[PDB]
Structures are given as C-alpha cells and as structure tokens.
Amino acid sequence: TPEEKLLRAIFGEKASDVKDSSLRVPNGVSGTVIDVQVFTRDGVEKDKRA
Amino acid sequence: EIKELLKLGDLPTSGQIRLYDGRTGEQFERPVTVGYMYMLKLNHLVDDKM
Amino acid sequence: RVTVQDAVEKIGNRFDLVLVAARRARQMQVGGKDPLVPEENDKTTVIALREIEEGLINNQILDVRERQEQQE
Amino acid sequence: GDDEDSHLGDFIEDTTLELPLDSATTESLRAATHDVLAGLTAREAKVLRMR
Amino acid sequence: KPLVGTGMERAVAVDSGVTAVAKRGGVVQYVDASRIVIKVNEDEMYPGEAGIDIYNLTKYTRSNQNTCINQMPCVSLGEPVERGDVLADGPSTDLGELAL
Amino acid sequence: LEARALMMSTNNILSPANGEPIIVPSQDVVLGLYYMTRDCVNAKGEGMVLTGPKEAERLYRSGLASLHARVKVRITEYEKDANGELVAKTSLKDTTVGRAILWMIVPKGLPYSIVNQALGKKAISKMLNTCYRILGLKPTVIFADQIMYTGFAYAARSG
Amino acid sequence: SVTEFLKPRLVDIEQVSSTHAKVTLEPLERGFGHTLGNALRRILLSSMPGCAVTEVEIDGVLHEYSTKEGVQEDILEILLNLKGLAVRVQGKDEVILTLNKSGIGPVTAADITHDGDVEIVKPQHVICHLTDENASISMRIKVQRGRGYVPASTRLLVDACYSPVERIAYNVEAARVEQRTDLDKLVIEMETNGTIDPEEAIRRAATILAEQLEAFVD
Amino acid sequence: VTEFLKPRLVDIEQVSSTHAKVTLEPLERGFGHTLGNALRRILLSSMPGCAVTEVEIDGVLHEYSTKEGVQEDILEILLNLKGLAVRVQGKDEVILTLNKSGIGPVTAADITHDGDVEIVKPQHVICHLTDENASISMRIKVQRGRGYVPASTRIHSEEDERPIGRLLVDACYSPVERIAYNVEAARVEQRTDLDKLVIEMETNGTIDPEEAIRRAATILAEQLEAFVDLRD
C-alpha cells in the first residue's frame, strides 16, 4: 500500500519477493541441538551440510 | 520388624523424631514423622501446560 | 479497592453502580477529565468507584455536568 | 479425534488475515507518514501524496 | 533405586528391553560410554565362533514422549560377568533394578 | 468494573444456593485453630492470671506458657447492644492461652464465647457467619484472611 | 561483589499511636527477613531491660487469695492492674512506692506518692475502686529492674514484665528490586507500654544484638 | 540490668578435615538460640565458594555425547566436576587444566596446580579412562561466588557470545553442608545461668570454621547496623 511504497521509496529498501518461512525454535524451550538429520529427494542434488 | 530395624540404627522405635523450625529454630511441639519416601516425577510438567 | 459496599450503598444498585462508574471512568480516561478525588496512582476504574463512595459522582451529578458542559 | 470431538476443520487456519498487530502497525505508519508530510512544503507534500 | 522395594524391580528392569543383559559369561574386555565388549568364558564358545561379543549402548535418543533413552555401562574393565547379568543400565534403572 | 464491582472474590462469599458463607477454612486452618483452642489439664503456666491477649501471646512465644494452659485472662469485648453503638465491656474469663491469643484477631462486635470452646470446623463456619450477621462484609473478609493466616501458622507450630 | 549483601534502602515507619508502630524494611537479601525479624523479636521480648512492679503488700488483708471489703475490685484484679503500671525508674535500681487512698473516687496511678527517681508514663492507670466513703486502702508496691518476663512461679507477689514491649510480631513479604524478585520485605509491628516508643525499642534491641556480635565483626 | 557478657569463641575443633565444632562460651540467658539460629541461617545461606562454572573438553560439542575411551557420558563428567572442592587463594576465578591419558581413574590429583589453587580432596574421581590409548584434557573454570547460580540464569543472553564447545555446569558456591548448634549451660563460678553455644558446621573443606563464623557475624552486624538507626 502507499506509505509502504513511500517508505521503501524513501529508504530504497526494495521488496524481497521471498517469504521468511523458516524453522525457528518453539517458545520457552532452550536446549542444545544434539543432532541434525537431512533427507534430500533423489531429484534435489544436496547441500554442503548434507 | 520395622521397629527392630529401627533399633539396629540408633533411630527411635516410634518413628517420630523432634524437629525444629527453620526460620525461628524453636522446636515443633509433639514430634513429627520423618523417613524416606520414594517420590516420582510424573510426566505432567508445568511448562507442558502453561 | 477490595469491597465496593460503600459505592453500592451510595447508588443503591449493583448494575447501575457498574454503569455509573464505567461512564465516569470513560470520561476520566479517554474523554479526559480531572478526578474529583485525589488519585493515589489508581486506574480510572478505582478512581471512579472511590468518587462514587464520597458522593462526588452519581448519574444525576453526571447528567447535570453534561448539561453544564453544553452550556459551555 | 476423541480429544474434544473436534472435526478436522478446527485446526486449519486462515492465513489471509491481517492480524491485529499488523493492522495496528499499518495505521501507525499511516499516521506517521501524515505527520512527516506535515514537515514538507505544500508543493512537495502535494506531489508526494499524489505521486 | 527404591530404598523400600519389593524384589520385583530387577525382574521388570531385565525383562524389558532397556538394560543390556549378557548372553554369555566372560570378562569385560573393554568398556566405554558407548559399548561393552565381552570375551566369553571358553565353556561357551560354540567352537566355530571368534569368542568375543559386543553390546552397543543406545545413547541419548528420543522416546515416544520426548524423554531421553540412554544406556549407561555398569561393569568395568576386567570384571567377570555371567549370562543374564545386566551390562547396560537402561533409562530409569540402577544396577539392574527398576528405579523410577 | 463488572469484575471489580460484581465478580470480585471479596464480594462473593456466600453460597448463592444458601446464604451461608462459602469462605469456610478447610483443613490445615481448622486443625490449627483446633489445636490452639483446645485445653489440656496440666500444661506450663496453669492458672496464671494474664493481663490480656497481648500478654498471653508474649508469654507463649517466649515459651513460658503452653498454648493450652487454662488461665484467667482479662478480656475486653465490644457489643453493639444499642442503636449500633458498640459499648465496651471488660471482664476476667477462664480460657486457654491459645483462646486469648486468637481473640486478638476477632473484630469488635463479636462476643467472647465465639472462641472460648474447641473450635472445630462448624465452630469456625459459625464464627464467620455471626461475624457477617453482625458486622458485614469488610470485617468478614479481613477476619477470614486473619483466620487463614493464624490457622496455618499455629498448625505449623502444632507439629 | 561477593561480600556486599544489601540494605533496606526504604524503611518506612508508621505509628498508629503514641505507643504502637509498624516498620517495613523493604529490600533485604533472601531469607534475611526471618533471620533479622526473629532475632529482633526474641531480643525485644526476652531480654530488654526495664522496671516493673514485682511484689505488693496490700497492707492488712493477707497472702492470697484475699478478703478485702471497701474495694469494688477483688484482689488479684488489683494485681492485674498493678502489673500493667508502666514505671521508669531513675538511678535507684529498686524502689518501694507506697499508695494510700480514702474516699469513693476511683483509684488511679496518679495517687502514688512522688519519689523523684520514679516516673509513671500513664498516671491515669486505674488500680482499684474504693466504692465506700469510709473505705480506704494502703499498699506497698516494689518496683525493681530486670531483663524480660519473669513470672511469679519462677520467683502477694506479681508477675513482672520488665521488657517495655507489650507485643511484637513481624511478618515477611516479597520484594523485587529490578530483576531479583526472590527478595524479602520485613514488616515489624510492635507496641510498647510507654517507657519507650516503638522505634526506640527496636533500635535498642538491634544495638544489643550488635554488641553480642562484637567479638567477630571485622 | 548490669550488662550482658559478650560471647567469644573459646576453641575450634577440627574433628575431621571438613567437620568442625566451634564454641562461643559466655552467652546470657536467651542468646544461645538467638545467635545460634541467626548464625546457622547466615552460614547455610551466604558463604563464599569456588564453584566450577564451566568446562571445555577437547573434542566435545555438547554435554550429551560420549568421548571415545572414557566410560562416562559428558553429562556425568560434568556432574562429577560439580562437587569438585577447590579453594583459590588470590583471584575471584581461575582456569584449571586437567590433562590425563592411559587406563585408569582420573582423580582431582590429575589437575595441574597454579599454586593459588588448592584442591582439598585430590582423591575425588572425575572420570575413568578405559582405553590404553585414550587421552582427555579439560579447561575447568573455577570461580568464587555465593549461593546457587544455575547455568540458565547465568546465561541471561551472554557475555558477548559463547563458543560451541563450552559447557556451563551449575554453580553452588557454598562450603557448608550442615550446621547444628547446641546451647548448654556453662560451668562458670561467677554465674550459673550462662550457657555456651556449640556449632557443628560441616564444610566441604574450603572454609575455615573460624573464618566462617567471623564472616557470619560480620554479615549479621552489617544488617544490624542498617537497623540500628532509622530513618525512613
């Protein structure tokens, strides 16, 4: 909406186009991350952590 | 046999010893029963509920 | 404020007391006014109820003050 | 099921809503934009409101 | 372990799969937070066999209720064992007994 | 204002099904008030004549007298026997030391026979009830809180 | 650091009367509420010097119980009235005060004979009622100095509450400073008999306790 | 009346390395329990200590893992490092290093001393190397505090940022485990009613009983000074 257009025009912080739908820890828990398993489908290549 | 096994230690046969108050340090009247009960932490936690 | 017995006694009803206190506290909170009683860092609710205790506030007084406000 | 006899539809959320914090921020930014444009000359203010 | 139990605790602890129990007597060749290696008594070798058998402990793992299942070794190096003796204490057991 | 004026916990104290107070103290409280308000034949300091409830408490807390030791105590009770006038009357009652230690918490309009017996459960409910029929709601809320406090305190000291 | 603890930055001292007061000490280290309140209560109520009546001779009647006419109040009720007589004695440790009266006017504490070293904080304190014009009573009371309460069993002799506190109770509530919400808030509440105001008895007991701890403080 | 006889500690008895029984002889009537309860509460509450606060073990990321060759989970090794009784001489914190290798128990004797640090119980076993070749090394982090500061409240957000391999053990800075005071009549030719106070304090080895009582009496007289004059 305008004033958001105007805001981003004044600060030049152009739009992302990409949501931040990431996985953050639930609220109130505070632990150590003891392990991480990854599962890539055979199409997807793999990343460095994988 | 509980009573005998109390006499084996130097504990009192009656099972009731005389206790003192923490904050004031004046002995509770009419002694209290103190022994070792085996407590269990049930899986009803306060942060799984709050 | 713990018991509202005196505020209830002044008005002589327990729903009308809630209504009178609510309208006076709305005057005192949003519409903007001065407490007729010395507020000891109380919300507008308790101030309104305490005012109703001292007789400073009731529905007759409030409508009369609305009349005077119009005459402003 | 059997928890409350609540059918599946109770847990499907509405992701199209501007949550009340979002609408609050929107209108706050609206008032702030107004009170900023107040600090501009009439020409700048009109051209920035209309542009 | 309960100071006042009944004598059922060892049975409940063993007969469930939480504690790693020996299969054959022998000596504890090597212990570790993760594994127990047992060198069998020569009476129980099954002459084709190599002799030693290994128990790999279940370290910090997630049960159905988000609790931690984790086995701890009980024996120590060069200590005898007999078949049916527990090597690994399971979650909420203590030297072989059910300790809730 | 509906919560404060209407549903606040210090407004609802009588059962709406029957006007008996719903603020009856339950189990550590009544056992405290029973243990303290319950005499025995020969405790420390039998038959002292205390000057009043303050002195009985000062005597008990220094440990010179026991909580149930029948003493003559000078009690001033205020009776609204009037057009609500609250005349005072002082006398010399025979009570345990705990009876008089507990008299310190009871408000004015209540007689002294209200605490001069053992004070089990119904005795406490009737005590709150007569306080409500004489004095109203503010003194009864204050009395209920003081009853809970003293019951828990002298029940812990009960051991 | 590790040796600093805390101190009550706000100590509010109410006084509901000439002799009954209430002192709140707001922030204190966790649990110091009880280790200070109990120490102070025990000191105020067990060892706090002062003068009080110890023995009486009612001049004629008998040892207990009594048979005394021309006195509306039965004897030992006069003893209850005498125990409450708040007296403060000057350099003379012990002094025997004699009281005589005749008439129908009610007997108050003002009627004792002036002795200079001895002062009465409440002279209007009733002692007896004569109730007959012909009736007249004489008594010799003995004011003495002691520490705390000393009953008559341990000793017409009366129980002696030398300590000028008639009642002291302390309550301990919660306080939070900025983050530490486990803090402690002491709420002392004391009434004296008149020889010293509440705030004076409190600090006198505190001084006594401080001097007991004099061989270890550094 | 005349005046109070002020107590004074006539003797201290190190009946064990840790168990001690001090005495405060001349006490007026009614001060045995006053001083005794106040002293027990101060001692059981507010006594400085040298709790081990972190551990950084070579080759370990979190507490929930196993080091090859040492037969304790890192959880259990930290729990054994909790009760480690250490008395530093000069600094309000210090970083002990513990290197060890070979088949055998790892007691607290296997830590190298700065000289300012004294491990009172060098038999206290920390882990068990159950491998001919296995080797472990820690940087234990002792530091002086008071009370009980769990790692959670310790990590409010952080100092600035904490590396991934640094474990926070739960600190309990309190040398004393047990206080038990008896007041008893003291055979004095002058007065008979006087009593003596006898304090059985049970430190863990890192607090001298005389210094414990002196620190208690100081902590108490501090608050009593805050009380002496009021003020408001």
Side-chain angles (χ1 to χ4, degrees), chain A, chain B, chain C, chain D, chain E, chain F, chain G residues 1-58 60-177 180-218, chain H residues 1-158 162-186 188 191-224 226-231:
Chain A
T1 82
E3 300 124 357
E4 189 67 6
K5 295 166 68 182
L6 167 49
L7 212 181
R8 297 193 167 274
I10 273 184
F11 298 160
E13 174 68 356
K14 252 311 99 193
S16 291
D17 105 293
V18 52
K19 297 217 62 167
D20 198 12
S21 148
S22 85
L23 157 83
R24 40 193 78 246
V25 175
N27 184 19
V29 343
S30 308
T32 307
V33 169
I34 66 184
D35 206 20
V36 181
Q37 321 165 357
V38 202
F39 306 114
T40 305
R41 186 160 54 62
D42 24 84
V44 196
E45 41 168 37
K46 258 154 183 182
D47 41 349
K48 323 173 202 181
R49 191 75 136 89
Chain B
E1 292 165 337
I2 293 163
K3 304 285 207 29
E4 202 167 359
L5 205 72
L6 280 186
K7 288 196 177 186
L8 196 49
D10 292 8
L11 323 176
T13 246
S14 179
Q16 299 183 335
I17 75 174
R18 99 185 193 161
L19 259 45
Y20 301 85
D21 187 359
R23 304 103 75 90
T24 73
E26 55 215 28
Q27 179 218 317
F28 296 116
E29 345 174 357
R30 60 162 323 144
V32 335
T33 288
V34 292
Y36 276 79
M37 191 202 273
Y38 183 85
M39 318 279 305
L40 295 66
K41 189 148 116 80
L42 298 187
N43 192 5
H44 298 84
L45 273 32
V46 70
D47 42 345
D48 291 353
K49 304 212 168 312
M50 180 255 261
Chain C
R1 182 172 193 74
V2 179
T3 70
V4 314
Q5 211 185 12
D6 291 20
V8 137
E9 292 285 359
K10 283 280 185 175
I11 296 229
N13 194 352
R14 184 167 262 280
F15 315 110
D16 312 344
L17 161 81
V18 168
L19 286 174
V20 170
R23 72 95 69 89
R24 168 82 179 114
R26 169 150 299 108
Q27 295 187 354
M28 194 168 4
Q29 152 181 114
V30 162
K33 293 280 186 171
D34 47 355
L36 280 44
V37 100
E39 52 168 23
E40 289 126 298
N41 198 341
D42 292 325
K43 329 298 280 292
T44 42
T45 309
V46 189
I47 299 178
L49 287 187
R50 293 165 46 193
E51 288 190 319
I52 293 173
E53 270 204 22
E54 333 277 330
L56 287 191
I57 275 309
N58 50 22
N59 188 20
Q60 169 68 227
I61 269 61
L62 290 163
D63 296 327
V64 155
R65 303 244 188 87
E66 299 293 347
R67 259 86 181 194
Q68 303 255 20
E69 156 262 28
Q70 285 306 317
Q71 318 307 59
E72 174 234 10
Chain D
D2 198 63
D3 52 348
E4 178 51 11
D5 198 15
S6 67
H7 60 119
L8 197 178
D10 197 4
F11 311 107
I12 308 179
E13 102 168 6
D14 192 320
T15 327
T16 77
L17 288 180
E18 204 69 17
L19 300 175
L21 227 172
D22 294 326
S23 309
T25 299
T26 284
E27 262 176 342
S28 168
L29 158 91
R30 170 141 173 260
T33 261
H34 178 91
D35 310 5
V36 161
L37 288 196
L40 286 179
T41 121
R43 302 192 54 91
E44 325 275 332
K46 187 177 176 179
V47 171
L48 228 62
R49 266 160 195 272
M50 154 172 54
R51 184 65 276 214
Chain E
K1 43 91 192 63
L3 236 47
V4 196
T6 54
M8 218 77 213
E9 6 270 346
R10 202 164 294 279
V12 185
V14 177
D15 279 331
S16 180
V18 283
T19 181
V21 177
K23 303 174 308 145
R24 304 180 263 171
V27 183
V28 171
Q29 197 196 9
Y30 161 84
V31 209
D32 192 6
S34 325
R35 87 172 29 184
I36 306 166
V37 184
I38 305 255
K39 174 48 183 179
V40 177
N41 295 340
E42 284 203 0
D43 163 62
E44 332 173 33
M45 224 68 124
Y46 279 110
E49 293 182 16
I52 101 267
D53 47 359
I54 307 161
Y55 313 86
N56 296 345
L57 273 34
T58 281
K59 307 316 297 178
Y60 290 78
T61 171
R62 171 199 173 276
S63 73
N64 284 306
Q65 341 272 130
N66 299 344
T67 50
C68 150
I69 320 189
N70 169 31
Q71 311 206 23
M72 308 222 53
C74 281
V75 294
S76 50
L77 278 199
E79 155 165 336
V81 297
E82 40 185 344
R83 76 107 44 187
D85 290 15
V86 314
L87 285 336
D89 254 333
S92 189
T93 82
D94 166 279
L95 278 167
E97 306 197 7
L98 192 64
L100 260 37
Chain F
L1 279 143
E2 291 174 358
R4 181 159 291 274
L6 287 175
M7 318 148 54
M8 172 76 84
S9 151
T10 56
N11 297 291
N12 326 342
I13 75 166
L14 316 171
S15 193
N18 61 91
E20 308 176 22
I22 201 57
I23 309 289
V24 209
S26 300
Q27 42 176 55
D28 309 328
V29 185
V30 348
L31 177 78
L33 272 72
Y34 173 90
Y35 177 78
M36 65 183 319
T37 63
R38 153 93 185 277
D39 56 327
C40 76
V41 55
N42 190 43
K44 270 191 299 174
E46 203 72 342
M48 307 195 194
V49 282
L50 291 354
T51 199
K54 290 155 133 182
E55 166 157 348
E57 186 192 11
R58 162 167 74 268
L59 233 37
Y60 155 73
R61 216 155 263 283
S62 54
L64 299 184
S66 192
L67 193 74
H68 18 261
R70 309 122 136 197
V71 296
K72 295 194 186 308
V73 171
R74 157 176 291 181
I75 307 294
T76 285
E77 29 168 324
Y78 296 78
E79 213 81 9
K80 324 178 59 188
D81 47 275
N83 12 321
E85 296 175 352
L86 256 193
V87 196
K89 157 167 200 174
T90 150
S91 144
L92 226 51
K93 318 291 188 321
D94 315 24
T95 55
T96 82
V97 156
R99 265 96 170 254
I101 293 173
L102 174 66
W103 176 252
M104 313 175 57
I105 77 169
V106 166
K108 299 305 198 197
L110 272 51
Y112 186 72
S113 67
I114 218 82
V115 311
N116 216 334
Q117 10 87 29
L119 276 223
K121 172 77 160 302
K122 281 80 192 72
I124 297 169
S125 194
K126 147 158 175 283
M127 187 158 74
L128 283 166
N129 187 36
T130 76
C131 174
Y132 189 79
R133 301 317 171 169
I134 309 194
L135 288 75
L137 201 108
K138 309 182 187 61
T140 319
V141 157
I142 289 163
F143 194 17
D145 272 312
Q146 279 325 280
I147 264 191
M148 201 196 38
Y149 298 163
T150 172
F152 284 141
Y154 287 82
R157 318 205 56 179
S158 143
Chain G
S1 61
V2 76
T3 310
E4 46 80 66
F5 278 87
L6 258 159
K7 284 169 188 57
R9 37 228 45 184
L10 69 99
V11 13
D12 148 59
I13 165 167
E14 304 179 41
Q15 50 201 15
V16 236
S17 32
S18 185
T19 177
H20 170 27
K22 141 167 168 179
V23 193
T24 87
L25 303 94
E26 167 70 349
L28 300 156
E29 283 284 26
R30 191 191 58 159
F32 273 81
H34 300 288
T35 144
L36 290 159
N38 182 39
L40 263 15
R41 181 189 45 79
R42 254 189 153 262
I43 299 188
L44 280 179
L45 164 155
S46 285
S47 42
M48 252 299 288
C51 286
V53 160
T54 286
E55 49 179 33
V56 188
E57 174 65 38
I58 311 294
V61 275
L62 209 252
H63 192 24
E64 326 231 6
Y65 287 78
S66 282
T67 160
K68 180 64 185 307
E69 351 273 311
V71 198
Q72 153 179 329
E73 313 174 347
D74 183 16
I75 305 195
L76 130 158
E77 174 173 315
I78 295 189
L79 294 201
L80 256 115
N81 302 123
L82 276 188
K83 178 197 315 199
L85 172 60
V87 184
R88 33 167 58 171
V89 185
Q90 287 302 154
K92 282 288 186 181
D93 162 83
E94 171 191 83
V95 24
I96 142 172
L97 301 87
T98 289
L99 163 62
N100 313 320
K101 206 169 182 173
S102 318
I104 313 178
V107 175
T108 66
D111 310 322
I112 321 188
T113 180
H114 280 141
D115 313 317
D117 310 11
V118 167
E119 295 200 319
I120 329 297
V121 13
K122 176 161 187 175
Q124 63 172 335
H125 193 211
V126 182
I127 305 183
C128 66
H129 274 52
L130 294 192
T131 230
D132 274 2
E133 193 89 1
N134 173 38
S136 183
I137 85 161
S138 59
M139 72 174 39
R140 310 188 304 284
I141 132 208
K142 161 136 108 158
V143 304
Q144 199 159 349
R145 222 187 295 261
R147 230 74 179 208
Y149 206 105
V150 170
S153 107
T154 310
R155 201 191 302 94
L156 292 167
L157 64 169
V158 321
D159 286 345
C161 27
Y162 307 97
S163 76
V165 303
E166 272 172 309
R167 131 187 179 84
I168 165 150
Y170 75 103
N171 182 51
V172 168
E173 355 234 317
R176 48 88 43 111
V177 161
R180 291 100 63 70
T181 62
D182 56 80
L183 282 244
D184 200 296
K185 169 181 191 175
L186 190 51
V187 209
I188 301 208
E189 167 179 20
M190 78 164 309
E191 336 174 17
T192 89
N193 63 4
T195 76
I196 60 183
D197 50 313
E199 146 172 20
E200 181 180 358
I202 281 193
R203 119 180 33 187
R204 197 164 306 247
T207 295
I208 283 178
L209 189 47
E211 310 176 9
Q212 304 299 318
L213 297 181
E214 198 157 89
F216 329 99
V217 174
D218 45 20
Chain H
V1 202
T2 166
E3 243 329 304
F4 296 109
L5 302 173
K6 292 175 186 177
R8 57 179 32 81
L9 61 161
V10 302
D11 67 324
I12 291 185
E13 160 182 340
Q14 294 281 178
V15 61
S16 174
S17 164
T18 78
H19 194 232
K21 318 204 320 178
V22 336
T23 312
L24 280 64
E25 173 76 5
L27 291 162
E28 306 296 346
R29 179 138 298 254
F31 269 97
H33 287 277
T34 320
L35 281 202
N37 193 42
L39 278 193
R40 149 185 171 113
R41 297 184 100 267
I42 311 298
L43 296 179
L44 274 168
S45 72
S46 350
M47 273 322 127
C50 279
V52 10
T53 273
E54 296 161 9
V55 184
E56 186 154 5
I57 295 173
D58 255 352
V60 188
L61 290 318
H62 41 105
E63 314 158 344
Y64 310 89
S65 46
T66 48
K67 197 197 195 65
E68 176 89 29
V70 20
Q71 77 149 298
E72 273 118 350
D73 299 14
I74 300 312
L75 209 306
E76 177 174 350
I77 295 185
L78 295 201
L79 272 50
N80 285 331
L81 274 181
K82 259 187 99 172
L84 169 75
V86 47
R87 181 173 41 189
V88 333
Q89 169 61 9
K91 319 201 168 195
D92 282 8
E93 73 149 18
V94 53
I95 295 224
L96 277 45
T97 291
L98 169 268
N99 277 18
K100 176 73 191 301
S101 77
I103 287 187
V106 168
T107 61
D110 294 332
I111 318 179
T112 314
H113 272 201
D114 317 31
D116 295 314
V117 174
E118 174 178 314
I119 316 284
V120 279
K121 200 190 175 194
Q123 51 169 318
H124 172 89
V125 25
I126 294 177
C127 66
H128 279 95
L129 270 275
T130 180
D131 207 359
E132 301 174 323
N133 181 35
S135 180
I136 102 167
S137 77
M138 342 194 192
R139 284 168 292 287
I140 322 194
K141 207 241 193 182
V142 190
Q143 61 175 340
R144 169 186 299 98
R146 117 156 120 285
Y148 172 71
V149 168
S152 333
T153 90
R154 167 183 310 122
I155 176 175
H156 19 278
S157 64
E158 245 301 316
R162 195 174 37 93
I164 17 205
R166 288 186 62 185
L167 302 342
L168 287 80
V169 349
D170 288 88
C172 331
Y173 324 88
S174 213
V176 311
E177 312 174 19
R178 201 175 54 88
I179 307 264
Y181 71 98
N182 325 332
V183 324
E184 41 211 27
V188 176
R191 255 152 313 281
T192 171
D193 55 325
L194 308 187
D195 9 1
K196 108 236 292 190
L197 181 59
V198 181
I199 317 226
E200 309 180 284
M201 83 179 51
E202 176 110 30
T203 54
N204 59 6
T206 90
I207 247 294
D208 253 325
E210 198 177 6
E211 208 50 72
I213 273 109
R214 290 204 130 262
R215 186 173 320 250
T218 293
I219 300 168
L220 216 192
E222 172 178 10
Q223 321 270 335
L224 285 185
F227 239 97
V228 77
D229 47 339
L230 39 299
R231 320 316 168 279

